[PDB]
Amino acid sequence: STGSATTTPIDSLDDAYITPVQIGTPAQTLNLDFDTGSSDLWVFSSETTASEVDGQTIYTPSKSTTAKLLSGATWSISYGDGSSSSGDVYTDTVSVGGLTVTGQAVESAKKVSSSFTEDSTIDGLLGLAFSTLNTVSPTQQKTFFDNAKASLDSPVFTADLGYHAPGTYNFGFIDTTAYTGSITYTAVSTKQGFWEWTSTGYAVGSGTFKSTSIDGIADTGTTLLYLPATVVSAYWAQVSGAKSSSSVGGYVFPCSATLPSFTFGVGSARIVIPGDYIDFGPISTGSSSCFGGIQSSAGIGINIFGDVALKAAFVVFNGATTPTLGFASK
């Protein structure tokens, strides 16, 4: 089997992407944030504290003839941005882009933090990291990918995120029309439960490539590119008037600037992030200070190849017995 679903930016900045997901019988379609940096499929629901729901579509398990309480199971998750959610667990039928999993754990939110309430466009998360990170207790549950994998034509999924445009998540096949040149594959460590890999270096604009190992994670659920402070400083040094602002929470730059590209290495291959991908617009409405899309990972404890980086590539998440990542230009 295969699946193919369009993923759509939630706003004009590509802060996140939402993908429609069919849950239950009859189908309830929710728009979920596919997150290769976590491993819980959780939804706004009929159980979510009413004051914490503001415009989201909810899953109502009592209206699904295939929903079953997973008795005694609870979940609770904290993300890198300090957001959180928790609740109980149903099993139900879940379909993505025509690919159906029966008996998928659908984690129903009783509680969500303010950042989830305030975002009406995201109805929950669909985790695509390794199932070792799943938070369900006392019986850990599998991700949608892990449950689908045996049925897929190939044990893979791909992320093809758009810049200020829709893109695609495919399951079980690699669309050879969706990228240019060849796919470069690189090793993955699953030790921390992530799609963790080592970039071979970087370049800023038309500058020479710096060969250096940068361990980080391929994370579709993180907006920005978080890299070591040395690398980030070298990038923003090429932008007149850019500076790190402790008040704002990172590097800002004059909205009048033209940003240089940023290149990262994948083995001997190179992915180029155009300068426009690094602009996240005014820090507050009407400001001439703009927020940068490359920020320091110092104090996060891991480098993160978030959407800024991944949207510049066609990305293969190879879930074979020895997982690997692939990157192609597009």
From Swiss-Prot:
UniProt keyword terms in alphabetical order: Aspartyl protease, Disulfide bond, Hydrolase, Protease, Signal, Zymogen
Record's catalysed reaction(s): Hydrolysis of proteins with specificity similar to that of pepsin A, prefers hydrophobic residues at P1 and P1', but does not cleave 14-Ala-|-Leu-15 in the B chain of insulin or Z-Glu-Tyr. Clots milk
Record bears the keyword Secreted: no
Domain Peptidase A1 positions: 17-328
GO biological process: proteolysis
GO molecular function, one term: aspartic-type endopeptidase activity
Entry keyword Disulfide bond: yes
Annotated catalytic residues: D35, S199
Family: Belongs to the peptidase A1 family.
UniProt protein name: Endothiapepsin
Gene name in the database record: EAPA
